[PDB]
Amino acid sequence: ELDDEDFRCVCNFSEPQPDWSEAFQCVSAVEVEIHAGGLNLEPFLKRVDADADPRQYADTVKALRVRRLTVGAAQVPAQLLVGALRVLAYSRLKELTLEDLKITGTMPPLPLEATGLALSSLRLRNVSWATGRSWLAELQQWLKPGLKVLSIAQAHSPAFSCEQVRAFPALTSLDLSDNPGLGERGLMAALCPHKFPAIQNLALRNTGMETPTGVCAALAAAGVQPHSLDLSHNSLRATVNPSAPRCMWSSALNSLNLSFAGLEQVPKGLPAKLRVLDLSSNRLNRAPQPDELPEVDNLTLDGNPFLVPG
């Protein structure tokens, strides 16, 4: 129905003919989600097809403290989803989240200038599109340049056309977690070069990769200098497998996470400088030799087979 305790919403639906009208209960709330449970929004056409600024559907959102939006079950044609994006451009919204959708149709070109919105931390999970090879680039046309955080999880044909993608001036973080099929090569063809110029925190979790050395080379090969870096869910190994004449580790690279993995012994290509190094829940063997350890700063360790006896 619509349960909220003075700080959220849900609008958990499922019925064969959703009476969305109750939605207005959780208006002007900061956090808000709109479930739908395997819905087909293809007969739902109205209203948004005379969408922008009238004398009725425009100033109602001149200031509507809804900063965090989630829309996680429906199936939206692109002809309208963009509509929802456009109206909100007026409003005060920052984080947008699509989850388990399926965009159909084909996305329309934009008339005037940047009618888009100042999205802050746009996230994506299991969302499928139309012109699959190019969905971000097309979607960018309705986002304001100011973007801080990108999380992209799940897909079908992971790739995107990193060639008409524009700017990303300040994409601070970047999360490509939960894509068990990205890989070190898929990675280089993920973060387009001379694009994503400024990347601080950087999550690359369960993307099904192996050794760090490849990642060291791949980021240098690409064109990024990360700060934090998360790998907390891969099948990691330990070798000198080609190549590493001197793995050009990104100097100012900092906080590294290697928790929860098939980590056998500590690998190679570990820069001697960090800030924080997490590593719990591993399958390790005693020694902290310089042959198997860079100078830490502070290592949180709560799992591991060191805290084993019992």
Swiss-Prot record:
PTM field: N- and O- glycosylated. O-glycosylated with a core 1 or possibly core 8 glycan.
Topological relation to the membrane, as annotated: Lipid-anchor; GPI-anchor
Cellular compartment(s): Cell membrane; Secreted; Membrane raft; Golgi apparatus
Keyword Membrane among record annotations: yes
UniProt-recorded Gene Ontology molecular function terms: lipopolysaccharide binding; lipopolysaccharide immune receptor activity; lipoteichoic acid binding; molecular carrier activity; opsonin receptor activity; peptidoglycan immune receptor activity
Chain positions of LRR repeats: 29-57, 58-93, 94-119, 120-147, 148-171, 172-199, 200-226, 227-253, 254-274, 275-296
Glycan-carrying positions: N12, N126, N257, N298
Protein induction: The expression in monocytes is highly induced by 27-hydroxycholesterol, priming monocytes/macrophages such that LPS-mediated inflammatory reaction is accelerated. Secretion of soluble CD14 is also enhanced.
GO terms for biological process, alphabetical: apoptotic process; cell surface pattern recognition receptor signaling pathway; cell surface receptor signaling pathway; cellular response to diacyl bacterial lipopeptide; cellular response to lipopolysaccharide; cellular response to lipoteichoic acid; cellular response to molecule of bacterial origin; cellular response to triacyl bacterial lipopeptide
Subunit-structure text: Interacts with LPS-bound LPB. Belongs to the lipopolysaccharide (LPS) receptor, a multi-protein complex containing at least CD14, LY96 and TLR4. Interacts with LPAR1. Interacts with the TLR2:TLR6 or TLR2:TLR1 heterodimers; upon interaction with ligands such as diacylated lipopeptides and triacylated lipopeptides, respectively. Interacts with MYO18A. Interacts with FSTL1.
Name of the protein described by the UniProt record: Monocyte differentiation antigen CD14
Residues of the full protein shown: 26 to 335 of 375
